[PDB]
C-alpha cells in the first residue's frame, strides 16, 4: 500500500507497516569527506552503521503541549560505535532516526519528532516554531513511526564527540494524548537510531 517500508542498515532491519515516508533533513546526501584537515588519514568503519535502541519517555495523558524530551544523538553506546568514539580522536557521521509510539487507532493526540542541530533549551514561545527543523508528526490515527535522515553538519569537518554533540532528537507533545475506554492507557516511545557514513581519523593510545 506504499505504507509498508523496510529500512536496512548494516545487518539490522526495521520494518513498519504505517510509514508516511522519510524526511531527508537538510540534505539528501553527505558533503565531501576527504577534507584538508585530515591529510587523507580518514577511514570508513562500516561495522558501526547499525541500529541501536533507546527508550525516550512514556507519553501519558498528563503531559501538556510543549513537553520536550531530548536525546543528544552521540550517546552512551555499548557497541562498535562507542568503541570507535573511545578509540579515535576525530569522527563524523550522519544519523538515521526512527521513533516509534505504538498505541492503537482509538487514541488521540500528536507528537512532533524533530532533529535539532546545536540544541539549546527552547523557551515557551519558541516551541511554536519547532517545525523549522527536520521533523515528522506521530498521530495514532495515521502512523506509529517517524523516520528522519540527517547528514553530518557542524562548524568543523570532524568533531570530537566527547566535546560537542552536533545533533539532538527532540520529541514534543503537540496535542495531549486522548484515551477512551478502548484505547491504550499510555504510549511508550522508543528509538531506532543508526549512524550513517561513519568516518574516523586519529588513532588514540590504548587506555592502559
Amino acid at each position, epitope marked *: 500500500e506504499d505504507r509498508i517500508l523496510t529500512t536496512r542498515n548494516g545487518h539490522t532491519t526495521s520494518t513498519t507497516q504505517s510509514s508516511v515516508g522519510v524526511t531527508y533533513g537538510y540534505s539528501t546526501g553527505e558533503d565531501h569527506v576527504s577534507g584538508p584537515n585530515t591529510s587523507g588519514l580518514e577511514t570508513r568503519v562500516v561495522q558501526a552503521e547499525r541500529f541501536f535502541k533507546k*527508550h525516550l519517555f512514556d507519553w*501519558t495523558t*498528563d503531559k*501538556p503541549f510543549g513537553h*520536550i524530551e531530548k536525546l543528544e544523538l552521540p550517546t552512551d553506546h555499548k557497541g562498535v560505535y562507542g568503541q570507535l568514539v573511545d578509540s579515535f580522536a576525530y569522527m563524523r557521521n550522519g544519523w538515521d532516526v526512527e521513533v516509534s509510539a505504538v498505541g492503537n487507532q482509538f487514541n488521540g493526540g500528536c507528537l512532533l519528532v524533530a532533529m535539532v542541530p546545536e540544541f539549546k533549551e527552547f523557551t*515557551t514561545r519558541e516551541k511554536y516554531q519547532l517545525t523549522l527543523f527536520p521533523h515528522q508528526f506521530i498521530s495514532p490515527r495515521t502512523n506509529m513511526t517517524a523516520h528522519i535522515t540527517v547528514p553530518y553538519l557542524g562548524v568543523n569537518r570532524y568533531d570530537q564527540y566527547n566535546k560537542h554533540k552536533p545533533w539532538t532528537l527532540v520529541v514534543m507533545v503537540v496535542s495531549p494524548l486522548t484515551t477512551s475506554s478502548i484505547g491504550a*492507557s499510555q504510549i511508550k516511545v522508543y528509538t531506532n537510531i543508526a549512524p550513517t557514513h561513519v568516518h574516523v581519523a586519529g588513532e588514540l593510545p590504548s587506555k592502559e
Partner: antibody
Amino acid sequence: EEKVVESGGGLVQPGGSLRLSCVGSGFNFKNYEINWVRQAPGKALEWLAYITQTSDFIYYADSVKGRFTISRDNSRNTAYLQMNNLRTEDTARYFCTRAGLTGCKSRHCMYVWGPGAEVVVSS
Amino acid sequence: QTVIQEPAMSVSLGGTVTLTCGFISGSVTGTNYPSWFQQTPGQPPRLLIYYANSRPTEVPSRFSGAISGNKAALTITGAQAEDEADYFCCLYKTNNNILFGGGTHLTVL
C-alpha cells in the same frame, strides 16, 4: 547507588519561612523529575509539589498553592522547596523523591525516596 | 476521603491477600495510573507497583497488581514475615492533584 539526601528541617514558629534542601547522588540530577511529599505522624502521604527536568512545568497541590515555592539547581544536583506563611497543620515529615526508573519515565514512577526531613511548626 | 482503602487486613503466613483501592464516586482505570507503596514504621516508603501492572526489578515477585472491578488491586502471593507494613495506593487525577490512599496496615499472622 541512586540515593537522595535532604536536610534543612527544624522547629519554627507559625507564619515563618524556611527552605528545604534536597541533595541527590548516584545519578544525573538534570535527567530526572523531583516530587515533594509530606507525611504527618500517624497520617498518610500527601503530594505537595512537582518540577520537571528544566523547570518548564511546575505544579502545586491545591492546599499548598502560593505558600510553597519549588526550585532546582541542576549544576549543584540540589532541589529546593521554599515554604512561606507556615501554618500549624504543616508539621509533617517532608520527603524529597525522584520520579523515574528503568522501565518507567514519567511523573507516576516515584521510585527514589529520601530519609525524610522533620519539620515542626508550633507556637 | 476521595480514595477508599481498607484500614487494615490480616493474612496468614504464606497465604494470599488482595488489597482494594478505589474512588468514592467513579471507576479506577489505567488513565489514573495506580501506584502502590510499602512503608514499614520508621522507614521511607518503597515503591512496589507502578502502572498497576509492573514491578521494579529489586521488588520481589510476590507483589503483583491488576485492575479488577473498577478498582486498583494489589495481590501478595505467599506472604512472608517482611510483608507486615503500611501499604499506600497512589492515584493520578489532573496535574495539580495526586491522591494517596488511606493506608492498609497489613498484619502477617
